[PDB]
């Protein structure tokens, strides 16, 4: 199947309580593999998947230096952004950055991305061509001018198209057991009366990987999207995911309702029925 490597960085200011909180995590697909936490004792980039543990001391030293450099940049950013938006110190603010690369089933580069947000909203992002920027407001235009004058996109492009893809392939190979697996969902539906005249029908998918999945309800073949409660896909904690969708239906009409499950691990999409 297709694959991705992504790094996620969050910095949060806490004025009058010292330095900002900085957390970095890295993922291959839906499997986390590294972390750094600025408040933690180690001050090291740390392994969070078995297959990254074999990387040598140069790797861990080098990744620790990178993540500390990102932390210092974001620390400065929190100050700069307060100035750009004429904000006070009375409150906490959040910078987020995420970047990485996608590859197809043949492990060739599909696309790259490098995005930044301030207080939960898009701030600036590299466009699809990896040569130009989308700035979301006027403050982010200032950053665009500075990043264009400094040729930031060219350095990012070299990473996203090259280095990023090379390390993703390395990780896919070393962690093949975990990363190149598909676990198809184990599916069922549950039925519970909510009164003498209505029932909740809940369609379940369990123990699947990767996390991408579609669960839908139909009534006589007609999608019931406005009437469906669909929960966020959630981790089981063992490396697999769970999700459910529910509808509340008049008792006696169960046989009109079907749940439909799509996942890359299934040989064909499943239709679950009450008959």
């Amino acid at each position: 199947g297709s694959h991705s490597m992504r790094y996620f960085f969050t910095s949060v200011s806490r004025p009058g309580r010292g330095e900002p909180r900085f957390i970095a995590v890295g993922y291959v697909d839906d499997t986390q593999f590294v972390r750094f936490d600025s408040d933690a004792a180690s001050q090291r980039m740390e392994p969070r998947a078995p297959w990254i543990e074999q990387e040598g001391p140069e790797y861990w030293d080098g990744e620790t230096r990178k993540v500390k450099a990102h932390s210092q940049t974001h620390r400065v950013d929190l100050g700069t952004l307060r100035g750009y938006y004429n904000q006070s110190e009375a409150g906490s603010h959040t910078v987020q950055r995420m970047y990485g690369c996608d590859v197809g089933s043949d492990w060739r580069f599909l696309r790259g991305y490098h995005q930044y947000a301030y207080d939960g909203k898009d701030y600036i992002a590299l466009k699809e061509d990896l040569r130009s920027w989308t700035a979301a407001d006027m403050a982010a235009q200032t950053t665009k001018h500075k990043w264009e004058a400094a040729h930031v996109a060219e350095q990012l492009r070299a990473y996203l198209e090259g280095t990023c893809v090379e390390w993703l392939r390395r990780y896919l190979e070393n962690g093949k057991e975990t990363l190149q697996r598909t676990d198809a969902p184990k599916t069922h539906m549950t039925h519970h009366a909510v009164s003498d005249h209505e029932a909740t029908l809940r369609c379940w998918a369990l123990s699947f990987y990767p996390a991408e999945i579609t669960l839908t309800w139909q009534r006589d073949g007609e999608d019931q999207t406005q009437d469906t409660e669909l929960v966020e896909t959630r981790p089981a904690g063992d490396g697999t995911f769970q999700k459910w969708a529910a509808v509340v239906v008049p008792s006696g009409q169960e046989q009109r309702y079907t749940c439909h499950v799509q996942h890359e691990g299934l040989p064909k999409p499943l239709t679950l029925r009450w008959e």
Binding site: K66, A69, T73, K146, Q155
Partner: peptide, 9 residues
């Protein structure tokens, strides 16, 4: 592995 070339805003 993570990136380098990360500049301040």
């Amino acid at each position: 592995a993570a990136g380098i070339g990360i500049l301040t805003v």
